[PDB]
Amino acid sequence: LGYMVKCLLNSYAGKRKCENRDSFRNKRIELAGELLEREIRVHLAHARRKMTRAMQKHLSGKPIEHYLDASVITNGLSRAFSTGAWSHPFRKMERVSGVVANLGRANPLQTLIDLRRTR
Amino acid sequence: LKEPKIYTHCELDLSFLLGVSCAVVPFANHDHGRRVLYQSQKHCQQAIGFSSTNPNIRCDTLSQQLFYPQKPLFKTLASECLKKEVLFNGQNAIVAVNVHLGYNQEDSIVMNKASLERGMFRS
Amino acid sequence: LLDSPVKGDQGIKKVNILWTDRPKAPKRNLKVTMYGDRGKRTALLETCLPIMDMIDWGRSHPDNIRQCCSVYGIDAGRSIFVANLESAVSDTGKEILREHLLLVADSLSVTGEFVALNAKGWSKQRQVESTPAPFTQACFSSPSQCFLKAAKEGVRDDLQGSIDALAWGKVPGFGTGDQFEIIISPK
Amino acid sequence: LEEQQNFPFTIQGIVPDIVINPHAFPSRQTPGQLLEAALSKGIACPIQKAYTKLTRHATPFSTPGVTEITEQLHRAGFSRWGNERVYNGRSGEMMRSMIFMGPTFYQRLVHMSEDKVKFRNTGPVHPLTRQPVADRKRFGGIKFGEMERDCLIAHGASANLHERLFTLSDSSQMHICRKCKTYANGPYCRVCVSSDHVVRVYVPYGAKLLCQELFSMGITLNFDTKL
Amino acid sequence: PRKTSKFMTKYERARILGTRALQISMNAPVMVELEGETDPLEIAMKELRQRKIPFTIRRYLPDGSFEEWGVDELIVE
Amino acid sequence: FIVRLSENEKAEDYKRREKVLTVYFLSTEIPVWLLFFALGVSSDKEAMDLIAFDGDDASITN
Amino acid sequence: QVPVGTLTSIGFSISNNNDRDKMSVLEVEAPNQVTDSRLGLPNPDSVCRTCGSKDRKVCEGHFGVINFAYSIINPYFLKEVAALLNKIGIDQRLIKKDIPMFNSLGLTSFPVTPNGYRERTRIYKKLVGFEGNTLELSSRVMECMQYSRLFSCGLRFMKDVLLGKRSDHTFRTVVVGDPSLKLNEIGIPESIAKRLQVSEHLNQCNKERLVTSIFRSLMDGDTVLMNRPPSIHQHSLIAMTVRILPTTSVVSLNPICCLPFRGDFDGDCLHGYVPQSIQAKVELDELVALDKQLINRQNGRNLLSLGQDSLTAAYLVNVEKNCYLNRAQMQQLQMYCPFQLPPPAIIKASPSSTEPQWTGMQLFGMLFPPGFDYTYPLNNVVVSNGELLSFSEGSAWLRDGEGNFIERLLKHDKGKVLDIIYSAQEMLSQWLLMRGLSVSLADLYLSSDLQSRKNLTEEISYGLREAEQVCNKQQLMVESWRDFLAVNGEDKEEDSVSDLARFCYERQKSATLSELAVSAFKDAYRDVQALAYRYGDQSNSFLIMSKAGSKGNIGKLVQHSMCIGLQNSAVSLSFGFPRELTCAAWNDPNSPLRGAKGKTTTESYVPYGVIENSFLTGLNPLESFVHSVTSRDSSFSGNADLPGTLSRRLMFFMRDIYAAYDGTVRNSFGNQLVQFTYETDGPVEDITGEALGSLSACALSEAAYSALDQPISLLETSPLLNLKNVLECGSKKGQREQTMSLYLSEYLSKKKHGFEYGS
Amino acid sequence: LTEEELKRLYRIQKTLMQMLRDRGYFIADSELTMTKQQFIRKHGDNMKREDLVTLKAKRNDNSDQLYIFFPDEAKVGVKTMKMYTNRMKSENVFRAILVVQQNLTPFARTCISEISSKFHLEVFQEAEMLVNIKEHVLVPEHQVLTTEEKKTLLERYTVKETQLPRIQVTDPIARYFGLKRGQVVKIIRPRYVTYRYVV
Ligand SMILES: [Mg+2]
Ligand SMILES: [Zn+2]
């Protein structure tokens, strides 16, 4: 924390330059290894919210395959891949629509540059 | 690298700084800055040429294919180490700059009637 | 004490010494003069005048049209708007005639003041001239607050404009229609 | 599409199959196409005499100079700058200036001619605004826009603008009573004595839908008619 | 009186020619008996050249008043 | 962990409004110098060597 | 049945409680079937009870009331009692009831959707005793008055329904070039002309022609409208004569006629409108066609100038002057021109020549009629009795300039100008085919065989090192350098002439002296661009198209041959290009790309660099990166809406101003006077009846669509933004920065150096 | 610095007579064309008040006169400007001009509401008219038309009283000549004519 305050004072004095977003030293990407995990991390909470709500009613007052409904991730991932909606990396209640692009097959050069891009 | 003994690193090749649709264009630095950007991601994406080799399993709309595709005469270094001759679409043509009766005015092209009947540019 | 002025005025930011060959507001009886360009930050010309006791006041005028009109009349406002438009269009690339430049100056200074190029300045121009036509004012802004607020007063629209006449099958007033009649007279 | 005999033919027998305009070169600013056409010509034509010392790389950032192409094309019978003396196809006489030639690499795009033709001969009608439908598969019709109407306003033609937005567009009728100012539907007003003197006007459906929306929004209309 | 122009404008000629060609298209008796020309644009042009149409221009002043103008007194280049 | 250097609009007597060090940790708005004495150093003169930079003292010491 | 009539005044009023129940009382009390068939068509195969009930033809809509026992105040009148409150009988009924005028001020009845535009059908099925509170019955109709189409749908409903309507009998095709047609002529192929029907009434001559084929095909003689999207100016709506020809489903016209269209043949389409009535057919060839709008009224000069090939051919014919064509190839070119052959100016030019050879400038006299008098002093060309006699280094009298032969031919007879420009193309093309224009590698080389390229390189490398010292001198005009420019000996003068990287680093940051470091390079580069006339022959194909002004200029040749020049953008951030951009200049502390400096607020930069390598030698990977940083501003496409929203709000301010019969302009709304006399330069009073403001708004739209949108870095904003800021007069956005003017007109001029001492 | 105040008051007294000369109110040469030292060497320099009330009538008539009021203290209210309103009703004139130093008060603005029907009383500040407005190059010369000439103009161009271009009363040229609502003004251009109706 002392170094964190010293780094703030060295940037307020004009010595250390501020870090800009328009560079690739302070910007990383994610290609289906840190982007596909967010849709699983969101939907497993939706599955746990339904399992707890199903176990709260059946105990107050053994279908283990019925209490764990598998029709949430299968109907969530296909819904996210169809319309192109995803989850926000920083926010929670936001949806982006730029992760999924339809592949073209007019010539094999288009499908070579459609796989290597950066948003 | 041979003359100064001060360097500690080196690049593999200067042609390996562009994309796969731009580093195969011949004389990519001689062109204008808004004329290789108008071709690397605007003309190669909609140029007919090779297609899928199995047209019996892939069924999709607007699947066009050229009859006689041709690799170009030149051989760039980005097309030699890749060992692939599919990213070059279109045929060769012996062009000639000439004012031909005003029929090629305002960025137009006059063509041959006895060349489109022998197999050139048929799709 | 470190922000109090020690030389000059307090509201003047900076001054520049330019040199133009064909300036606005000519001498009207040599050569090309050099003038200062004072930039201010109450009024505009009513506070820059008694601060300088070195009065060399010739044809000095503010550069902004909304200030030049409200200082020296709508005639000087039109005369500086024409001179500001005939430089911008000439620097745009083309060479327009003055026939299309004076008409815009005579049409944007009808009610004695220059109005904006929007619908809020068009309604305030069409409501002073006693011409209650609220139909065309709804085709520029949103039509929600143009028919509800006009029906709460009882306005009487008329087929006067071109868009207000072409929408109901009629012809406009000018052109080849509604300006003369072709009738067989008995004489 | 010109025939083969009409093109300017060369001494060897080659015929130019694609002739482009030379005026597009100092405006599009694309050099290196005349270098590609001079590098593909020296590697396709045979040397009289050395088929190993020639350069055929054309690397993007390792381009060979002009002094290497103009000395490799010279060693086979052609000129240094790539141009050659051509004849005439119609007359047959020689030309006063040479014509540059070279085997470039041209691609064909997707946008053809038959995929852009679109006309309208009063086909199907859109059920909402009674306008022609904007379908390329069915019968179409190009929209007469705002500036395309102002350009006919500026020309002074108001009788051609009358058949464009009313007659060729949606054309409907509208009845209205004379004493009472309430329209209903032949002509039958329940506010007035029915069928005494009722007049009808000519209003397009685009403005008649506006009256139906205003009456459903809560704003009535009281309009009078001449004669 | 007549405080308007003496020359016929093109915006009135383009309506007079159309109104005259509409009559010839609906079998009107031609009172100029020109032969050789048959199209309703050429007949109305030769009728305006001979100034034998029974048409008068009733121009509308923007103030509210009006004044007529016969085709026999109106000239056109 | 957001260390902010801004004006102190809160806990002021409407005159002293200068640049102060506030840290935004779990929505607490605690001062940074009390977080210094909360753990570790327990000394005010020995808390400047952690923020030692050897710079010109113009308006940062204030 | 009803007689016909025209409406004249639209009146708006609030629908009272009597205004609803007076009409269309059909099925008022029916909560189980609120979408009954007596008022609309609920089912796709439904039937109206009181109509003829055809497919949306007889029934135009049938309304209906909704009887509500509860009394609810309308929301439009609820805001009056919120402002009609005071601290104070008779005063509570006078100021609060003027526009309702003692009405009921309550919503008793309610109109229903007539089931033609109903999302909205199953909503009013439960308002027969909906609730008890007076809020759930107000919100249920407030949502119905807000879910309508007239609620922001909005302006998109208006400009797609009332303003812009689609029309039938149209066609849309791409266009190609064809110089074989006339000026006011187009070409429709057989596959389109065999389907487009044009109605024309029966006549006494063709009674056996129509009945053996009213609805006939698009034959010759008809006229159609032509249009290119978007409509730039007034002359983009020319109606030309049709002419059928066998083509494979594409239209074609004269490439010299594409100058009002402002489009090329790289894929642009052409809208086609076909008229059907006679009143829309006679008016097309009288005010709209190409033989009538021959005067470009935006500029006041000719509209149809020379194209690309004809301009270069008319240049080369009069500048080459060393071709002597004989009588064999001269009488062939005398067929495209309607005039006879001149006598031969050369009888015997050599003892080895027998046939009388003509003159190249004598060939250009086959277009001017006998009696044409034209004199241009800037090019020394004299035309006496239909034959030009002199020519000395000129190209301005051919294209669209001040005084040219096209305008002087349009002022001479104005009857056969379209038969003159046509023969000035169909003969000049056949003449240019006999010579041949080609761009070879020697045209890009611009040099001789040996050592002339080396002299050009060694001169470019010395002219690009003096234009740097010129720009270094201009940066000493800063008020901190007032002690250096005095006549006194200094000690730190060597520190201001040895530091060359520091003066380049100062040009990047603090963009207030970088506006005089660009204009100095642009004035020192005029002596560098003049090297393209000493080097290279006069027969170079670039100098022919550059001196004639066909395509490009001298700026688009020095980048091909010698050097590209300077590169400056509007605004960048955190990187700037240094001087001597090579591989060795890629270090961290001594270059402004990675690190600013060592001593320092330099977060924002304005880059400026000069490249010495041309488009022929080859660009470096850093020089191809500077050319991608700088030319990125001309790659965006999110700026075309800015000349589209300007001329839309500028339109109706002048679109109602016309020319009355009293000799003065008027206003179509209230018969007001804009001005008392039109400011016409010509003394002919022929502008009467036309909308002179509708051709003045497009006159400013044409100067905004073709605006050179290459912005200056930081001082000047844009030539279009400077036009918008002048046009926006009453838009008072704020009083932040107001600039004055103080003219120095006083008694100071009598003294020596009075203005400099007074300022 | 009383010399700067005496110069600022000399400029107002020099531009007021030049305004009234352009309005034509029979100005003698004793007050007009005064040098910078004549106001000190002729008038009383030891007068630290606004003692510049000058009586002046018209040229073609002597019934209606004009009062050039100069109030001493700033921020004039209804309790102090009673004598500034009583004199015009006591000597029976119908035109008066008063100048102010600072901005006005709304209590004084509610006094001229029901009093402007009989006696017209307009105000403009002295801090703005340090220079002459009519002597500017950008504004042309004007000619206020008489009712005997306004009648023959509306019957020649057959234009009504509301179909003319408008000029506001708060404009510094329509307030320079003392124009009311109803009269038109002829405006020339450097050589066409364009009239303007005061709204
Ligand atoms: Mg195009
Ligand atoms: Zn029905």
JSON list of N, CA, C and O and ligand atoms in Angstrom, two decimals, chain G residues 37-41 47-53 58-62 114, ligand 2:
[
{"chain": "G", "resi": 37, "resn": "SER", "atom": "N", "xyz": [-67.11, -9.24, -35.56]},
{"chain": "G", "resi": 37, "resn": "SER", "atom": "CA", "xyz": [-66.95, -9.10, -37.01]},
{"chain": "G", "resi": 37, "resn": "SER", "atom": "C", "xyz": [-67.75, -7.95, -37.60]},
{"chain": "G", "resi": 37, "resn": "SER", "atom": "O", "xyz": [-67.62, -7.68, -38.80]},
{"chain": "G", "resi": 38, "resn": "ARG", "atom": "N", "xyz": [-68.57, -7.27, -36.80]},
{"chain": "G", "resi": 38, "resn": "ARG", "atom": "CA", "xyz": [-69.37, -6.16, -37.32]},
{"chain": "G", "resi": 38, "resn": "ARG", "atom": "C", "xyz": [-68.58, -4.87, -37.47]},
{"chain": "G", "resi": 38, "resn": "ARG", "atom": "O", "xyz": [-69.10, -3.91, -38.04]},
{"chain": "G", "resi": 39, "resn": "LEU", "atom": "N", "xyz": [-67.34, -4.82, -36.96]},
{"chain": "G", "resi": 39, "resn": "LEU", "atom": "CA", "xyz": [-66.53, -3.61, -37.01]},
{"chain": "G", "resi": 39, "resn": "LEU", "atom": "C", "xyz": [-65.20, -3.77, -37.73]},
{"chain": "G", "resi": 39, "resn": "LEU", "atom": "O", "xyz": [-64.57, -2.76, -38.04]},
{"chain": "G", "resi": 40, "resn": "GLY", "atom": "N", "xyz": [-64.76, -4.99, -38.00]},
{"chain": "G", "resi": 40, "resn": "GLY", "atom": "CA", "xyz": [-63.50, -5.22, -38.68]},
{"chain": "G", "resi": 40, "resn": "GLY", "atom": "C", "xyz": [-63.40, -6.64, -39.19]},
{"chain": "G", "resi": 40, "resn": "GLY", "atom": "O", "xyz": [-64.41, -7.33, -39.35]},
{"chain": "G", "resi": 41, "resn": "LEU", "atom": "N", "xyz": [-62.16, -7.08, -39.44]},
{"chain": "G", "resi": 41, "resn": "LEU", "atom": "CA", "xyz": [-61.87, -8.43, -39.92]},
{"chain": "G", "resi": 41, "resn": "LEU", "atom": "C", "xyz": [-60.94, -9.10, -38.91]},
{"chain": "G", "resi": 41, "resn": "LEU", "atom": "O", "xyz": [-59.71, -9.04, -39.06]},
{"chain": "G", "resi": 47, "resn": "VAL", "atom": "N", "xyz": [-65.73, -11.73, -42.13]},
{"chain": "G", "resi": 47, "resn": "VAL", "atom": "CA", "xyz": [-66.71, -11.02, -42.95]},
{"chain": "G", "resi": 47, "resn": "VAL", "atom": "C", "xyz": [-67.29, -9.87, -42.14]},
{"chain": "G", "resi": 47, "resn": "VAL", "atom": "O", "xyz": [-67.59, -10.02, -40.95]},
{"chain": "G", "resi": 48, "resn": "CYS", "atom": "N", "xyz": [-67.39, -8.69, -42.75]},
{"chain": "G", "resi": 48, "resn": "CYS", "atom": "CA", "xyz": [-68.08, -7.58, -42.11]},
{"chain": "G", "resi": 48, "resn": "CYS", "atom": "C", "xyz": [-69.59, -7.74, -42.26]},
{"chain": "G", "resi": 48, "resn": "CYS", "atom": "O", "xyz": [-70.07, -8.25, -43.28]},
{"chain": "G", "resi": 49, "resn": "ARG", "atom": "N", "xyz": [-70.33, -7.31, -41.25]},
{"chain": "G", "resi": 49, "resn": "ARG", "atom": "CA", "xyz": [-71.78, -7.47, -41.26]},
{"chain": "G", "resi": 49, "resn": "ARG", "atom": "C", "xyz": [-72.45, -6.43, -42.15]},
{"chain": "G", "resi": 49, "resn": "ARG", "atom": "O", "xyz": [-73.37, -6.74, -42.91]},
{"chain": "G", "resi": 50, "resn": "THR", "atom": "N", "xyz": [-71.98, -5.18, -42.08]},
{"chain": "G", "resi": 50, "resn": "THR", "atom": "CA", "xyz": [-72.63, -4.06, -42.75]},
{"chain": "G", "resi": 50, "resn": "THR", "atom": "C", "xyz": [-71.79, -3.50, -43.91]},
{"chain": "G", "resi": 50, "resn": "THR", "atom": "O", "xyz": [-71.84, -2.31, -44.21]},
{"chain": "G", "resi": 51, "resn": "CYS", "atom": "N", "xyz": [-71.02, -4.37, -44.58]},
{"chain": "G", "resi": 51, "resn": "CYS", "atom": "CA", "xyz": [-70.20, -3.94, -45.70]},
{"chain": "G", "resi": 51, "resn": "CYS", "atom": "C", "xyz": [-70.43, -4.87, -46.88]},
{"chain": "G", "resi": 51, "resn": "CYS", "atom": "O", "xyz": [-71.23, -5.80, -46.82]},
{"chain": "G", "resi": 52, "resn": "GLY", "atom": "N", "xyz": [-69.70, -4.59, -47.96]},
{"chain": "G", "resi": 52, "resn": "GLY", "atom": "CA", "xyz": [-69.65, -5.50, -49.09]},
{"chain": "G", "resi": 52, "resn": "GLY", "atom": "C", "xyz": [-68.71, -6.65, -48.80]},
{"chain": "G", "resi": 52, "resn": "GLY", "atom": "O", "xyz": [-68.84, -7.73, -49.38]},
{"chain": "G", "resi": 53, "resn": "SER", "atom": "N", "xyz": [-67.76, -6.40, -47.89]},
{"chain": "G", "resi": 53, "resn": "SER", "atom": "CA", "xyz": [-66.84, -7.38, -47.32]},
{"chain": "G", "resi": 53, "resn": "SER", "atom": "C", "xyz": [-65.98, -8.06, -48.40]},
{"chain": "G", "resi": 53, "resn": "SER", "atom": "O", "xyz": [-66.08, -9.27, -48.64]},
{"chain": "G", "resi": 58, "resn": "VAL", "atom": "N", "xyz": [-63.77, -2.53, -49.78]},
{"chain": "G", "resi": 58, "resn": "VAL", "atom": "CA", "xyz": [-65.01, -1.82, -49.50]},
{"chain": "G", "resi": 58, "resn": "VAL", "atom": "C", "xyz": [-64.98, -1.22, -48.09]},
{"chain": "G", "resi": 58, "resn": "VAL", "atom": "O", "xyz": [-65.31, -0.05, -47.89]},
{"chain": "G", "resi": 59, "resn": "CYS", "atom": "N", "xyz": [-64.56, -2.01, -47.11]},
{"chain": "G", "resi": 59, "resn": "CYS", "atom": "CA", "xyz": [-64.55, -1.58, -45.72]},
{"chain": "G", "resi": 59, "resn": "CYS", "atom": "C", "xyz": [-63.30, -0.74, -45.46]},
{"chain": "G", "resi": 59, "resn": "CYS", "atom": "O", "xyz": [-62.18, -1.22, -45.61]},
{"chain": "G", "resi": 60, "resn": "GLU", "atom": "N", "xyz": [-63.51, 0.52, -45.06]},
{"chain": "G", "resi": 60, "resn": "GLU", "atom": "CA", "xyz": [-62.43, 1.43, -44.74]},
{"chain": "G", "resi": 60, "resn": "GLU", "atom": "C", "xyz": [-62.24, 1.61, -43.24]},
{"chain": "G", "resi": 60, "resn": "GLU", "atom": "O", "xyz": [-61.50, 2.51, -42.82]},
{"chain": "G", "resi": 61, "resn": "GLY", "atom": "N", "xyz": [-62.88, 0.79, -42.43]},
{"chain": "G", "resi": 61, "resn": "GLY", "atom": "CA", "xyz": [-62.79, 0.88, -40.99]},
{"chain": "G", "resi": 61, "resn": "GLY", "atom": "C", "xyz": [-64.13, 1.26, -40.37]},
{"chain": "G", "resi": 61, "resn": "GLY", "atom": "O", "xyz": [-64.90, 2.06, -40.90]},
{"chain": "G", "resi": 62, "resn": "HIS", "atom": "N", "xyz": [-64.40, 0.65, -39.21]},
{"chain": "G", "resi": 62, "resn": "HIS", "atom": "CA", "xyz": [-65.66, 0.88, -38.50]},
{"chain": "G", "resi": 62, "resn": "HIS", "atom": "C", "xyz": [-65.34, 1.01, -37.02]},
{"chain": "G", "resi": 62, "resn": "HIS", "atom": "O", "xyz": [-64.86, 0.06, -36.40]},
{"chain": "G", "resi": 114, "resn": "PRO", "atom": "N", "xyz": [-60.55, -0.25, -34.92]},
{"chain": "G", "resi": 114, "resn": "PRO", "atom": "CA", "xyz": [-61.49, -0.85, -35.88]},
{"chain": "G", "resi": 114, "resn": "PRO", "atom": "C", "xyz": [-61.08, -2.21, -36.44]},
{"chain": "G", "resi": 114, "resn": "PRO", "atom": "O", "xyz": [-61.63, -2.62, -37.47]},
{"chain": "I", "resi": 2, "resn": "ZN", "atom": "ZN", "xyz": [-66.48, -3.60, -42.25]}
]
